[PDB]
Design a binder for this molecule. Structure first.
Ligand SMILES: [Hg+2]
Ligand SMILES: [Hg+2]
Ligand SMILES: [Hg+2]
Ligand SMILES: [Hg+2]
Ligand SMILES: [Hg+2]
Ligand SMILES: [Hg+2]
Lengths: 258, 258, 258
C-alpha cells in the first residue's frame, strides 16, 4: 500500500512544480526503499525522473509496492492546499482506482482530503542514465536559470559548449547573438556558489530553449544543479533533494530536435 | 443631501471591492442613520447588501435621504485614487444626476474630485434576511477563502454540510473529489481564530463555486466571517465593519442553481 | 568608436524602459561629449530624446562619433541581463553592422555578451526644443504618475490648464468627469516634494492619455519631473539624470491629435 507522510506539504508541491507544464502524465511507484516517478513529454525529448528515499518522509510504510498513473494537471490543481506548512500524507491501497492526498494542520482543526482519479499507464520505466558522461558540471541553479532566461530571448536553440576549463552557452537568432561564458572556481567564502567542471572530452550540444526553460524550475528544490553531457545520450540536469533527486534528461537537437 | 466623509478612502475602496465583478448596478441610499446599498446579479442568485452607520464616518450630515443608482464598474474605475490614506467625501444634492467623490490629502495640496454619472434604478430594496437560520457559524475569513479556493478547482458546486459539532465542505467533479472538515474550537491564545457553530438543525446545501469565490473578497473587511444557513432561504455570509456590515445572500442550488 | 561603460547596468535598463513600448526604432549617436538618442513614434506625436554626458559613465572613450539605429524591442529583450548590479559596456566600431552589449560581474566569473543587429535609419535628429515656454512646472514624478493614472480611466484625453498659482488636470468622458488640482508649495522638510510653477502666460492644452501613460515611466529615473508647456509647440516632460536627461516632447491634440 502507499503511505507516505511529508513533514511539509511544500516539498511535494515544489517537486510536482517540476513536472508541471512540461509533461501531462506521471507514473509513480512506491516501494520498500521509497518513491520513484517518471514522466515523458509527447515528443519524447524530455524525461522527468524522481526519487525520494524513505528518509525524506516523516513516516513511510510499504509492505507492498503500488504503481499509479495520473494526470499531472489534476495533481497540481490539488497541490495548492498544502499551506506549505501543512502536513501531507499520500495514501493508496494495493489495487487503487484513486490516490488520496491528506493535508492536516498540527491541531485537529482543519483536514483537507482529496481523492484523485488515477489513469492506467503501461508500466515501462526507462533507465537511460549513463555510466560516464563526456563532461560534468555543477553551478548555482539560480545562475543556470539566469543563463537560460538570458539566451532564451534570442533563439529557440541554446548551445552548450565545453572545453578545458570553459563552459559556454550560446544563442543566435533573428535579432542577433548572445553568449554567457563561465569559468570553474572554488569559493571558500561559501562553496555553494562555486562552479565545478570535470571534462573528459570537449562537448558541444544544442538544446531547444523551450525545454531548458521547463528544466530551470528545479532551482526551487536545490541550490545547485548538476549538468551531465554526452554526445552519445540525452543530457542529464539534476536537482538533489535530502534523500533523493529530481532529474531531467533532455535529448540534444539533431539539428532540429529539442 | 449626501455628505459622507470617510477618514480613509481605503475603507470605501474595500467595500466596493466586495460588490466588484459579481454585480453591475448598485443602489445606494443615504439617510439619517447611515448609508445602505444593495446590488443583485443578473441571474438573481446573489444579493450584496451594505450598511454603514453614522459612526463609521469622520463627518456625516443628512437632513434629507437621497437614493442613487450607479454602475459598479464606473465606480471602481474611479475608486483607485484614494491613496488609501486620502480622505474621501461622497457628496450629492437631493435630486442628483451625479455623485461627487472628493479625495483630499491632509494638506491643501492635491485634490482629486470626480463627478460620476448616475443610473435610474427602480427603488426596490429587498428584506430577505431571516429571523432564525438552521445553523450559524463563524470562522476566520482567510480560512474560509482557502476552503473555497481549495474546492473550487474540483467542481462548479461546493456543498456545505452541518451536523452536531461538524462542518464539512465538499466538491466532487471530473478529476476527483475533495473535502475540508473543520470542528468548533475556542482559542484563548487569540479568539479571532476560533470556529463557532450553533446548530438547531443539520443542514446540507450546495452553492455554485463561482459565487462563493465572489463572496470571499469580504476577508479584506473583517477577520471573521459569519455564515448562516437555512433550507428555507438564501444563505447569508456576513463581514462586519466598525458600525456596519457587508452581507452576501446566496441562493442554494436547487440541483442546478448557483 | 563606441566604448561606454555604465557602473550599473540598471541605469541603462531604466533609460531604455522609457523608450519602451511607445517607440519602435531608436537612433543613437555617441560622440566626444557623450551619447544622445532620439526616437519618434509612427504617428509622429511623440519624440523621446536622451542625453548622457561623459560623467555618467565609469569609462567612456570616443575618438570618432558613431551613429547607430536599432529596434527598441530587440534591445529591451536583451536588456534584462544586467542583474542591475552588473557592469554594462556598450561597444561598436566606426562602421558597425552590430552593437555589442557586454555585461560582467565584478569577478571574472560570468560574462554575458550580446551582438545586436543594427537597422539603417536616415540620420535626422530633430531640435524642436523652445527657448521659452508659456509655463513651466515641476513636481514629484510619482505624483504626476498618479495624476495621469487617475484621469486616464475617464477619457482618452487629459487636459492640463495653468493659471496663476494653479495647475489643473482634467478628464471627461462617458462615465463622468474628474479633475486633480494642485498648488505650488515649498516643503523645507524635504524640497523634493515641492511643486514649483512659473507662469508667463496661462496655458490650456489637451493630450492623448495613452501618450501621457507612456511618459510617466520616467519616474523610475528621477524623483521630479519638469513639464514645459506652450501653445506654439509640443510639450516637454523632462526627467533629469546625473549628467543627462530623458525628454518626452508630446504634440497637443488639435482637437483630435494625441
Ligand atoms: Hg508502497
Ligand atoms: Hg516543468
Ligand atoms: Hg442623506
Ligand atoms: Hg464580488
Ligand atoms: Hg563615439
Ligand atoms: Hg515609453
Amino acid at each position: 500500500m502507499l503511505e507516505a507522510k511529508f513533514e511539509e506539504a511544500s516539498l511535494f508541491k515544489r517537486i510536482i512544480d517540476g513536472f508541471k507544464d512540461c509533461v501531462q502524465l506521471v507514473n509513480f511507484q512506491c516501494k520498500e526503499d521509497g518513491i520513484i516517478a517518471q514522466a515523458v513529454d509527447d515528443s519524447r525529448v524530455l524525461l522527468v525522473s524522481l526519487e525520494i528515499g524513505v528518509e525524506a518522509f516523516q513516516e513511510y510504510r510499504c509492505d507492498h509496492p503500488v504503481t499509479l498513473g495520473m494526470d499531472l494537471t489534476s495533481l497540481s490543481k490539488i497541490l495548492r492546499c498544502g499551506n506549505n506548512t501543512d502536513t501531507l500524507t499520500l495514501i493508496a491501497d494495493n489495487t487503487p482506482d484513486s490516490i488520496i492526498l491528506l493535508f492536516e494542520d498540527t491541531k485537529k482543526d482543519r483536514i483537507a482530503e482529496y481523492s484523485l482519479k488515477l489513469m492506467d499507464i503501461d508500466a515501462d520505466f526507462l533507465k537511460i542514465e549513463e555510466l560516464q558522461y563526456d563532461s560534468t558540471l555543477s553551478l548555482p541553479s539560480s545562475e543556470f536559470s539566469k543563463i537560460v532566461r538570458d539566451l532564451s530571448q534570442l533563439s529557440d536553440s541554446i548551445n552548450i559548449m565545453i572545453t578545458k576549463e570553459t563552459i559556454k552557452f550560446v544563442a543566435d537568432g533573428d535579432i542577433g547573438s548572445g553568449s554567457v561564458i563561465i569559468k570553474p572556481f572554488v569559493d571558500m567564502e561559501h562553496p555553494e556558489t562555486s562552479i565545478k567542471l570535470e571534462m573528459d572530452q570537449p562537448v558541444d550540444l544544442t538544446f531547444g530553449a523551450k525545454y531548458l526553460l521547463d528544466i530551470i524550475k528545479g532551482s526551487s528544490l536545490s541550490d545547485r544543479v548538476g549538468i551531465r553531457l554526452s554526445s552519445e545520450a540525452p543530457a542529464l540536469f539534476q536537482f538533489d533533494l535530502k534523500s533523493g533527486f529530481l532529474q531531467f534528461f533532455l535529448a540534444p537537437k539533431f539539428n532540429d530536435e529539442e
